[PDB]
Design a binder for this molecule. Structure first.
Ligand SMILES: [Cl-]
Ligand SMILES: [Cl-]
Ligand SMILES: [Cl-]
Ligand SMILES: [Cl-]
Ligand SMILES: [Cl-]
Ligand SMILES: [Cl-]
Lengths: 347, 347, 347
């Protein structure tokens, strides 16, 4: 018994769609949904998606409000669609997936993930939901998360963090650490050994190791001395070189955090979406040093150290491949006389 | 001699409509009003209302720019329309009232509040304006504010604060404390004894009593000890319980302020409007504890203490009714063995 | 070989238009440009201009990403159009000029500034670009910037600061100090002696002289004493008088910065554009003092001191004209018994 007015009743009275009965008066103007309260219109939803306003409204209302994998993880694993839920993409302000299963009659391709239309799609299954483990067992293509073990299946330990109503966090009152499983053409896959990005932000950056505390509290030379990093070119890769018109390096999020706390700067996020490597057009306000495409990745500094110390440094240039967030990220490594010169990602 | 181009002339040259003569060139695209300056278009107004763009522009331009009652107060008193002014609703970014009297030919139902069409409407009258007291005396339904006494009429002392160009404040260079009066079907009403909410915000929260200073500077146990509040369950009602997936309590704005200064969190304001009780979908970034509908009220802590200490605590559950901002707010009180368990509002 | 899909390819892969070959899939809905990534639409550009969405997108993409004169300077010099570039106006979120030369086939009036249609227009030429000095020499009307001397032409030293991707700054890793030249009807112009505004903002305000450091660290009376400013009415002009309903003075940006650091307030920017004098509707949150049109200018305090100390103070009221940012700004000077009473700009 689905209806625009009933979706709005749930948003007004429950904060989201909860399956409660009721109606409130609704107006649609431009891409915006309003409801009438004490005689005046109140905005409930502004559509920023490429879907029709009332469809986007319903999917937003029906979003998963438990901790869920970050969208970049789901993307990297090839997820096309979710079983009987909506993963809302808060970095795009839109649904993570174009179609649905058992959610919304305007976007559903099926009511259940067992229907034939779903076979070529990589369906996301949530073991926290009754019966979805068994649906993963029966599905041709899929990704499954669980909180515990699944009998017979070897797990891959996922990131510590997950997304709860658009907030990425390491749960204390709720669990955000998942096991991951994947199937392709009916065959369980070995998922690769992988690093994970930390999904932190520049302002409220918080270190997660002693090495990272030292990086943010020591001077560049004192830190490089303590961790014996001469020759790996941290001065440019991590800290950033602001002395020439073309901004040098600055590829680790922690480097930007250190800089930002000292001297602010501008980060144009010109592909606003969730992804393992982010590209920014950066302009440093103090110096005028800038760079059109500054690839930035948020690795735990210890992990980045392990990576760069695990390469052969005897060639002018080479592609270095690293599995991060279950996807292969390609880095360019440039070396001169056995020292790194630069080492930066690519999107 | 009203005109779009003349409204725009006033906005460009006076900041608002002042009744000055003049025209500037104006363009309308989408819901936005532009004016031409040195050959280029400059945005003057983005329509976020459900009214036509040029109508909304004119009402915004003609908004009252003196301290006026906060919209929630006017709503709680049943005000339908204002006499010869526009109360702009800054929390909705729209007019507080759908129709006007003597303001705008597109929204006017009348030029003067004495016309017949106005009789069933509760008209807002401003005693600071010449002759509006006498119009209130003659009106069938209305609400009146004044700065001083009105001969023959018993006043109700309003909130200390009022709204000036969307800024809620307790005036020092201007007066924001009003007397209130109300008429229904030609009969002066006794207005009820009422508490008032304090209309503060979470970030720049500022305490207004010694008890509130103590609440923000002491630890939970030291504060509860000083004010002898054992058994009233402040630990959950006011301070918030973040230890389980479902966020406990947190119903007083001052509690959120204390928490926010320590550990930030997310407050989705999913019915963005002015009202005595606000509902937020809250996600605590540190713990992952969350709640879809967290009812929040900004009472002076001393007032909330008086309320909760004035209840009978011998029943498992009961509705407690409290007059706040001239409206009856219903609270749920839950008690176990003579102690409060929880006590929270409802919108 | 221009195309919407190729402009989008450049934005996705280079941060801006770089003339690279390639296409990506593009959707246009409302005034927004999206591109398809891994099967979902991602927003690349929201049109806030009065131009068609795809045209605005292309001009934004083709914006000058080197330090360029601030738009107010170009406006004050009468610039109509730029030679073979786009000056993007970040305060309006739109092109600084309506038409182009050699940029975009939808807005071009010409491919080269030598075409006849350009003769009556004041063309902006950038000496940092090969051959534009010589085009300025041949143009009937134009403005030229250079980093160094131009043989035969006497320069005017421009502001220290310029705009780089919307960030106004004094360059250290890049040069932002330009020489300026101007021609009208084929005749080189003497540009006037001029003060320049400092283009700072209220929050992150940074002083640029010892006098300004003293102004922000001393009490009003101690500062006025040190710089012997009795009788010039700084108390109202610069510091602001918040004691009456009508806010007194507050015409220097540094005064607002001092106030803002102490007690926040509201600044409605009701003509959002770049200009030498800005008009704000200001409401002081602490006191309720307010003013519909508060003219604000960001002069180096030493420069403002020089100006006000260089006037005759023997008349009740007079217009004082001052050349700032190459334009004549008119001030009202009011004096009583040989003392300034107020002295404030006009836009
Ligand atoms: Cl599970
Ligand atoms: Cl690998
Ligand atoms: Cl009065
Ligand atoms: Cl009551
Ligand atoms: Cl040059
Ligand atoms: Cl002059």
């Amino acid at each position: 018994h689905m209806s625009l007015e009933n979706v709005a009743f749930n948003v007004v009275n429950k904060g989201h769609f909860d399956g409660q009965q009721g109606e409130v008066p609704v107006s649609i103007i431009n891409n915006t949904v309003y409801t009438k309260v004490d005689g005046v219109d109140v905005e409930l939803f502004e559509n920023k998606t490429t879907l029709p306003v009332n469809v986007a409204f319903e999917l937003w209302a029906k979003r998963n409000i438990k901790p869920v994998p970050e969208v970049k993880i789901l993307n990297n694993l090839g997820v096309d669609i979710a079983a009987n839920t909506v993963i809302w993409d808060y970095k795009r302000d839109a649904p993570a997936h174009i179609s649905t299963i058992g959610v919304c009659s305007m976007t559903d391709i099926a009511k259940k993930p067992t229907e034939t239309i779903c076979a070529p799609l990589t369906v996301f299954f949530d073991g926290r939901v009754d019966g979805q483990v068994d649906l993963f067992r029966n599905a041709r293509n899929g990704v499954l998360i669980t909180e515990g073990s699944v009998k017979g299946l070897q797990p891959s330990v996922g990131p510590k963090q997950a997304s709860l109503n658009g907030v990425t966090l390491i749960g204390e009152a709720v669990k955000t650490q998942f096991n991951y499983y994947k199937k392709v053409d009916g065959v369980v896959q070995q998922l690769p050994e992988t690093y994970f990005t930390q999904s932190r932000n520049l302002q409220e950056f918080k270190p997660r190791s002693q090495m990272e505390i030292d990086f943010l509290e020591l001077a560049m030379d004192e830190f490089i001395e303590r961790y014996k990093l001469e020759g790996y070119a941290f001065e440019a890769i991590v800290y950033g070189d602001f002395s020439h018109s073309q901004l040098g390096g600055l590829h680790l999020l922690i480097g930007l955090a250190k800089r930002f706390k000292e001297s602010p700067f501008e980060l144009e996020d010109f592909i606003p979406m969730d992804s393992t490597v982010k590209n920014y057009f950066i302009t440093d306000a103090q110096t005028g040093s800038s760079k059109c495409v500054c690839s930035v990745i948020d690795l735990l500094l210890d992990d980045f150290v392990e990576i760069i110390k695990s390469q052969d440094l005897s060639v002018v240039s080479k592609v270095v491949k690293v599995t991060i967030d279950y996807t292969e990220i390609s880095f360019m490594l440039w070396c001169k006389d056995g020292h790194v010169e630069t080492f930066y990602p690519k999107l």
